[PDB]
Design a protein around this ligand. Sequence first.
Ligand SMILES: Cn1cc(C(F)(F)F)nc1[C@@H]1CCCNC1
Length: 435
Amino acid sequence: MLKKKQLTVLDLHPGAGKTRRVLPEIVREAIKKRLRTVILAPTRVVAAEMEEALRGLPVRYMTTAVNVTHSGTEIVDLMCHATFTSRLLQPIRVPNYNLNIMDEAHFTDPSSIAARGYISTRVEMGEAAAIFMTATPPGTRDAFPDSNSPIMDTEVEVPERAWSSGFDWVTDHSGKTVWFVPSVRNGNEIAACLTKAGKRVIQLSRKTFETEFQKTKNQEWDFVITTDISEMGANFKADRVIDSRRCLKPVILDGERVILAGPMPVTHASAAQRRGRIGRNPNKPGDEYMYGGGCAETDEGHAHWLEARMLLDNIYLQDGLIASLYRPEADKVAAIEGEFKLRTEQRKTFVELMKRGDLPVWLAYQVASAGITYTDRRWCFDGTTNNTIMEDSVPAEVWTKYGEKRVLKPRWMDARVCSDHAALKSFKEFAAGKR
Ligand SMILES: Cn1cc(C(F)(F)F)nc1[C@@H]1CCCNC1
């Protein structure tokens, strides 16, 4: 599969050994053939596991998840999906890799969709080879794939709020459970309910993943409450998955604002990945998968696909050519290639609002396309009254860089900036001119 002009989809079931068995073999072949290679990890936890499986081989780790001394003789680079897309957007020159390997190639974050589109366009052009590793490739309709050991699948009503009665099967369990919830706020309520009942609970989310995931290997626990971030390679020594089968979906209303719609059904790929956390030990059959709803294709019209088109329109490919999205996922957005292409100064602002500002892609695009400079924060305060960000049922207030107290009322409203305490705290600092 290491011949140019070819994209291979390695669709082995979860736990088949794509990362620890197949990946080192591919890397050995690539090094033997002198192919300049990139290995793309979804998260820093998967990058650290990749280092363990590739230990010894000459790989340059362009991540702070690994403390390795690079010898300067490596032709294989390893970085996160976001780092690849980030360096492509920045004026830093990215080598034209002969071989592009993406682990967990089902990841639906905007930068992972943009990386797949850039890589597949290069392959379509006959300029490179690529391998996409995932049990659930884009376009999968099977939520119950094969596993290392048999799994008990059980359709049951799963609590999405705290409960006093009616769900004995949840707490009358003597093993370890991984519970997928649609949001951090929903996870907090369920975790507080389990803690009140004498349970040891760890909570995981996109922002707190690195610190808290370490606790799953450092201490004993009864439950892990996680958002969909644990679908991307996170391993646990658990015997049960409780899956709400629900997710939050960012949606752009009338091209003017972003809302977090739902909770709504997960896609089949997400349900298969969530179920995939268990049934991984062939010596421990009978791990349980309790699911609380059905699947639907909620990736259609999801903002991440539009956001990925905003990223690719501002990545240089060849003269005025623009990368297309990877074909099985190109129908998820009604978009024209090049419609989000920005001029040089606005594009520089767009990059900075994402890289330094930490704003969602859609919100960074609104600000940059309006001709506003990175450091100009007047837009955080001059929106309509219906854009007032609320904190505990009362308007959120910040001290501006001018020393005044103002109501946070952004010109463009993106629900992701105030979806939880940590997101709102970060957006208040941005509005205050603190970064
Ligand atoms: C010029 N400027 C910019 C901002 C911001 F912080 F909201 F962006 N506030 C101001 C006020 C306007 C009224 C007099 N005090 C300064």
